Design a protein around this ligand. Structure first.
Ligand SMILES: Cc1cc2nc3c(=O)[nH]c(=O)nc-3n(C[C@H](O)[C@H](O)[C@H](O)COP(=O)(O)O)c2cc1C
Ligand code: SF4
Ligand code: SF4
Ligand code: SF4
Ligand code: SF4
Ligand code: FES
Ligand code: FES
Ligand SMILES: [Zn+2]
Lengths: 26, 210, 106, 83, 24, 80, 263, 426
């Protein structure tokens, strides 16, 4: 039930976590 | 669409991203292309909304400041989208889908029930500031038509009573099992899974040659 | 009826007058509304065509019933806003009845 | 004196005209007459203003009495409307 | 049912500088 | 933004006295050739009218808007 | 080289590649009825009052926008491009407040003319009209913006010709109002040009509010002396006192714009 | 003839039933030939879709291969980009909500499979902000994939580099539009641009860009895996492939089934989903592609089937293939009336014909439901409808006109009676 519970910052904070993976900028 | 400065809603209300928020703000900036920050106004404006639902004129000015854009540029973005609220928002902020698909499947039905339960007109916050009801448009998830999004909860396939039950859950306690409160899973033919009742083929199944 | 003069100085009564009779100059009244500082119909110039009656959007300028206004001096015939407004107040009851009778036709 | 207070003056060379003949001025000046008009209260956000009587009024305009801060005033009648 | 005098009503168009009454 | 009144050449006589009238305040003019503006299709023909009628003339060259390059795609350029 | 040949009603005009369909009509001499397109302002396509019909094409094209291509004959007076104007003018007028005898852009309206030449004899909008709330943009421009046809030339000028970047669109739907979100006056030189550039009389000049009406104004072409750019200007005089000074175009000196001081 | 086999059904994880997460995805074997495909070449990938002849899975129908082919032209020094619009504002498009929520990965490899086809530097996925929970699911999935190294520089153990991003929508149906998705991505107001500077030519941030319905991006990896032919066979002529069909409103079991395209309309409610609530004769009308497409009345429906060619013959659009059904128990005049209310609360207002026109039809439509308006007004709305259809900057004005046109086209007698009903009681 992951869908069943997430925080208001899930999308943003998860993304920040992904920032490291994010390939270099243009 | 005019912000007549009011003691409550005006820049005297100071706004600043929490040390934690500011962190988030940049995460947004680099997700967008380098040399491009303006593109992040919306995502940022959203975190100002995450910080505070009211998002007053002071908050938009800060957004423009952090994002170094013409302030109006932020004002235009906030006004265009319904997601942003330029006025105080109820803690729960329920929104009822009333497009034809939901109406055909009774969406209107739900409304009358919720107005009575919240004991308030549609469009304003309860005196308790507990809930705010608004007649929003198609919120997606039509297969499940009766529907009422509450801060993303997106409850679905709800019969009038169900909501009253949900509202009570919200009124006392929290996290009232958000989702379609009917036997069906996500979207599934109520009968079953005609589409695929067999087991899914595994990796490299019938992968074409070449 | 309230007491606010109908003319709002659009000045097309001046535009369509065939004889150049009506002279209008205007400025925003303190109220902020638009009114004519000077409205002068030169009746000796006027040929009583009745187009001004036609042209006015608010129908402020009307052809009144009275035909007996012969005057000893030429200057009396030139009419400023105060004479016409006074003429309007005197004959308003009949003017209203006359416009009442003919407006469906127009 | 008059609406826009025309005052041929004590030194003008035109005030000569009224000598032995009165001037045309107006009582019930309009400037104050609509100010004397009550504010038409309304329920709707926007309201019309035929001027009263349709064809016998002014080209109909819709006024936005949306802010109690200001009573909309039809540019034609000078009638203030109180939301 | 049961002598006028014509005049211009407009203001002075071009106001005129008044000389300083203070002598110098 | 209409340009149908910038097509034909016109020659206009010099402006003259417009004193206020004492009795009614109407503008009064002593110059007969004031309101007269004759319209001529080409610069050459208008110059001819001045020469044979003996009025002095000072022709002003037509100035037409310069071609301007526009393209909806160009402003979408974040670069510039 | 670089000279396509496009036909405007079969006139084989030749234009540099990259000229808009509206521009192609101009060199032949035809005028596309236009709102929201100003020569020295970016193309926006908001009004779409300029829809024309390139030959052998399913839909009509936006003149100000389509770069004319090779051998596309423009049909500016077709039976279609007139229903594409008879039906747009239906819309601009539908939400318009008819206070033309208040609108001091009475004879200076690019919206009555185009209605009066290219639009429709009568109205079918039996429904109700909308109203916006007049605000303060300053002491020079009177914005009776219930007049606005949302043509976004102000928002352009206020950003492109002058660098104010303040005026902006607010909201969506039929209550998009193009006014400053917070009431901050539009204080800048070059400010008064908005008056001249708004074809509607929504925002017009407050000093010259109701002193005159354009047919009367005798127009004498003269030179700006307030500043040393010597901007060309037209002094509009009625019965012998100047009523307004508005710009007249000089490519090199003031190209259609004049300062707040000299008007 | 539909009845696609479960095996052929591309989106197996539909309805979930299999871990939407990577380990479920590996059992799905979604990342099976990704390295090979990219290795084959970008030209090989577009050959696969050209052979597939796939049509746009979003409301507009265009050959998918040709659209991708357009920005396959050599780079001019600006990074090419991929934009995936997960926004689906159209009513009845819960179609996409599934792939995103249930099978996020399929779309992730759809993105890189598609990316090398257009040589995109990176892909931005605009999921509607309404779906916050949905977003939570995809970036968890995107995070898994990079951790694996499936995406990122040297993605899938290959020379090619790709980065996938998710962008927050803000409750706008118009954001969905191709030129307007971009502007929202750009951060300006969501107002469409004109087509003359085409999306490939002027991209987001002035860099060539391409926009695909999430379904379109998702099927590209499986179509390359199964080959264009396999996919090509299921379709009908130009029409081809299985497209998810959502049936909502007045049906016994409303559900989204990815059954085959070219399905008799009578068959999909009768055989899958749920037979029309109240009986197949209790069908006042069918909305095949969602609100934008014109509704078709019952006599036309079973005769016609769900494929874009057949529908355009029928004067209606396959669109998002969202089937909305209206029993004889509904006031259509009010049903379509709320869709016009759906469009007045939503059109951007950038263009004159949509701004005033859609509001004008809304006012007339509300009077029509009451019956206050006279019978002559009904063809008046016809004429207002086509003024807005061909003059609008984007397609939404195209879309607003069609339901109005459908109501007048097949239900003109009913509206006249509502006209008559009010006149009688005075
Ligand atoms: C008003 C409007 C709303 C739209 N909304 C969506 C949407 O929510 N999702 C979507 O995929 N396409 C939407 N479209 C179509 C897109 O602009 C674009 O054509 C389509 O997404 C391309 O997908 P495809 O080419 O892969 O089919 C919309 C178009 C218009 C005019
Ligand atoms: S009289 Fe009628 S027309 Fe002449 S100005 Fe006053 S209002 Fe306009
Ligand atoms: S703008 Fe002023 S003048 Fe032009 S039409 Fe609207 S109101 Fe009449
Ligand atoms: S104000 Fe004048 S210019 Fe600015 S939008 Fe409204 S009309 Fe176009
Ligand atoms: S049609 Fe005109 S108004 Fe409606 S959305 Fe597309 S652009 Fe904005
Ligand atoms: S209309 Fe209610 S979710 Fe589609
Ligand atoms: S004039 Fe054609 S787009 Fe505005
Ligand atoms: Zn009035």
């Amino acid at each position: 039930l992951q869908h069943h519970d997430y925080n208001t910052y899930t999308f943003l904070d998860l993304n920040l976590d992904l920032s490291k993976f994010r390939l270099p900028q243009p | 669409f005019v912000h007549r400065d009011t003691p409550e809603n005006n820049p005297d209300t100071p706004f600043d991203f929490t040390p934690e928020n500011y962190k988030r703000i940049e995460a947004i900036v680099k997700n967008y292309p380098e040399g491009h920050q303006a593109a992040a106004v919306l995502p940022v404006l959203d975190l100002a909304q995450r910080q505070n639902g009211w998002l007053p004129i002071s908050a938009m000015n800060k957004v423009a400041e952090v994002l170094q854009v013409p302030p109006m540029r932020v004002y235009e973005v906030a006004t265009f989208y319904t997601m942003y609220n330029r006025k105080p928002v109820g803690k729960y902020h329920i929104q009822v889908c009333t497009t034809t698909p939901c109406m055909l499947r009774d969406s209107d039905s739900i409304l009358e029930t919720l107005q009575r339960k919240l004991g308030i007109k549609v469009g304003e916050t309860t005196p308790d500031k507990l809930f705010t009801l608004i007649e929003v448009e198609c919120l997606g998830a039509c297969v499940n038509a009766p529907m009422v999004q509450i801060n993303d909860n997106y409850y679905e396939d709800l019969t009038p009573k169900d909501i009253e039950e949900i509202i009570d859950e919200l009124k006392a306690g929290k996290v009232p099992k958000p989702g379609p409160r009917s036997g069906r899973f996500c979207c599934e033919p109520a009968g079953g899974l005609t589409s695929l009742t067999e087991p899914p083929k595994g990796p490299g199944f019938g992968v074409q040659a070449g | 009826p309230s007491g606010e003069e109908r003319c709002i100085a659009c000045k097309l009564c001046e535009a369509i007058c065939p004889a150049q009779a009506i002279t209008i100059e205007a400025e925003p009244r303190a109220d902020g509304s638009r009114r004519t500082t000077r409205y002068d119909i030169d009746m000796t110039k006027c040929i009583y065509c009745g187009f001004c009656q036609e042209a006015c959007p608010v129908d402020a300028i009307v052809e009144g019933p009275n035909f007996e206004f012969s005057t000893e001096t030429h200057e009396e015939l030139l009419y400023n806003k105060e004479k016409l407004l006074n003429n309007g107040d005197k004959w308003e009851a009949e003017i209203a009845a006359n416009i009442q009778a003919d407006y469906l036709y127009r | 004196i008059t609406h826009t207070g025309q005052v041929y003056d004590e030194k003008d060379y035109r005030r000569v005209r009224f000598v032995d003949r009165q001037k045309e001025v107006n009582e019930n000046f309009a400037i104050d007459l609509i100010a004397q008009q009550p504010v038409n209260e309304v329920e709707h956000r926007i309201i019309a203003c035929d001027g009263g009587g349709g064809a016998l009024g002014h080209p109909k305009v819709y006024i936005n009495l949306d802010k109690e801060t200001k009573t909309g005033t039809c540019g034609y009648c000078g009638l203030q409307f109180k939301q | 049912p049961t002598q006028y005098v014509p005049y211009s009503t407009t203001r002075k168009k071009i106001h005129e500088w008044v000389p300083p009454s203070t002598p110098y | 933004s209409g340009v149908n009144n910038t097509k034909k050449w016109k020659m206009e006589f010099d402006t003259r006295e417009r004193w206020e009238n004492p009795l009614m305040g109407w503008a009064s003019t002593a110059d007969p050739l004031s309101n007269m503006v004759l319209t001529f299709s080409a610069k050459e023909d208008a110059i001819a009218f001045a020469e044979k009628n003996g009025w002095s003339y000072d022709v002003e060259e037509k100035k037409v808007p310069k071609p301007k390059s526009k393209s909806y795609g160009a402003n979408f350029s974040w670069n510039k | 080289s670089n000279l396509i040949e496009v036909f405007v009603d079969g006139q084989s005009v030749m234009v540099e590649p990259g000229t808009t369909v509206l521009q192609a009509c101009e060199k032949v001499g035809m005028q596309i009825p236009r709102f929201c397109y100003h020569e020295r302002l970016s193309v926006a396509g908001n009004c779409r009052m300029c829809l024309v019909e390139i030959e052998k094409a399913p839909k009509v094209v936006a003149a100000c926008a389509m770069p004319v291509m090779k051998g596309w004959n423009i049909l500016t007076n077709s039976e279609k491009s007139k229903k594409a104007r008879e039906g747009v003018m239906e819309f601009l007028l539908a939400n318009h407040p008819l206070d033309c005898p208040i609108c001091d852009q009475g004879g200076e309206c690019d919206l009555q003319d185009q209605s009066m030449m290219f639009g429709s004899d009568r109205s079918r909008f039996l429904e109700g009209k909308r109203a916006v709330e007049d605000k303060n943009i300053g002491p020079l421009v009177k914005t009776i913006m219930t007049r606005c046809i949302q043509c976004t030339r102000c928002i352009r000028f206020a950003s492109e010709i002058a660098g104010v970047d303040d005026l902006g669109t607010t909201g969506r739907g039929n209550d998009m109002q193009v006014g400053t979100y917070i009431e901050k006056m539009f204080m800048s030189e070059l400010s008064g040009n908005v008056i001249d550039i708004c074809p509607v009389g929504a925002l017009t000049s407050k000093p010259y509010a109701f002193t005159a009406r354009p047919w009367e104004t005798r127009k004498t072409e003269s030179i700006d002396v307030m500043d040393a750019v010597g901007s060309n200007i037209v002094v509009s005089t009625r019965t012998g006192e100047v009523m307004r000074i508005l710009p007249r175009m000089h490519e090199d000196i003031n190209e259609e714009w004049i300062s707040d001081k000299t008007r | 003839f539909g009845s696609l086999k479960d095996e052929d059904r591309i989106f197996t994880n539909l309805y979930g039933r299999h871990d939407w997460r990577l380990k479920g995805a590996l059992r799905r074997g979604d990342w099976y030939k990704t390295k090979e495909i990219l290795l084959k070449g970008p030209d090989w990938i577009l050959g696969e879709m050209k052979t597939s002849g796939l049509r746009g899975r979003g409301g507009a129908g265009f050959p998918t291969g040709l659209k991708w082919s357009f920005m396959n032209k050599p780079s001019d020094g600006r990074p090419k980009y991929l934009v995936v619009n997960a926004d689906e504002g159209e009513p009845g498009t819960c179609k996409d909500r599934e792939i995103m929520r249930h099978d996020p990965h399929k779309l992730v490899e759809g993105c890189l499979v598609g990316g090398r086809a257009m040589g995109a530097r990176a892909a931005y996925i605009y999921i509607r902000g309404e779906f916050y929970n949905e977003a939570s699911n995809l970036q968890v999935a995107i995070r898994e994939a990079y951790e694996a190294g499936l995406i990122g520089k040297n993605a899938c153990g290959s020379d090619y580099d790709f980065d996938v991003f998710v962008v927050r929508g803000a409750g706008a149906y118009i954001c969905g539009e191709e030129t307007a998705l971009i502007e929202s991505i750009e951060g300006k107001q969501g107002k469409p641009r004109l087509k003359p500077p085409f999306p490939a030519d002027v991209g987001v941030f002035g860099c060539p860009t391409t926009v695909a319905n999430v379904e379109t991006v998702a099927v590209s990896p499986t179509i390359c895996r199964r080959g264009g032919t396999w996919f090509a066979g299921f379709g009908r002529e130009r029409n081809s492939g299985t497209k998810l069909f959502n049936i909502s409103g007045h049906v016994n079991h409303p559900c989204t089934v990815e059954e085959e395209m070219s399905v008799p309309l009578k068959e999909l409610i009768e055989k899958h989903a749920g037979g029309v609530t109240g009986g197949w004769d209790n069908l006042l009308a069918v909305i095949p592609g969602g609100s934008s497409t014109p509704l078709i009345p019952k006599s036309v429906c079973e005769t016609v089937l769900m494929d874009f060619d057949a529908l355009v013959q029928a004067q209606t659009g396959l669109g998002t293939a969202a089937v909305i059904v209206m029993d004889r128990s509904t006031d259509i005049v009010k049903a379509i009336a709320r869709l016009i209310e759906f469009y007045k609360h939503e059109s951007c207002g950038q263009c004159t014909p949509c701004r005033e026109g859609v509001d004008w039809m809304n006012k007339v439509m509300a009077r029509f439901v009451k019956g206050d308006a006279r019978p002559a007004e009904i063809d008046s709305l016809w004429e207002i409808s086509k003024q807005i259809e061909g003059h609008t900057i984007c397609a939404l004005g195209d879309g607003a006109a069609w339901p109005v046109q459908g109501l007048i086209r097949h239900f003109r007698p009913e509206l006249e009676d509502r006209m008559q009903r009010f006149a009688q009681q005075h």
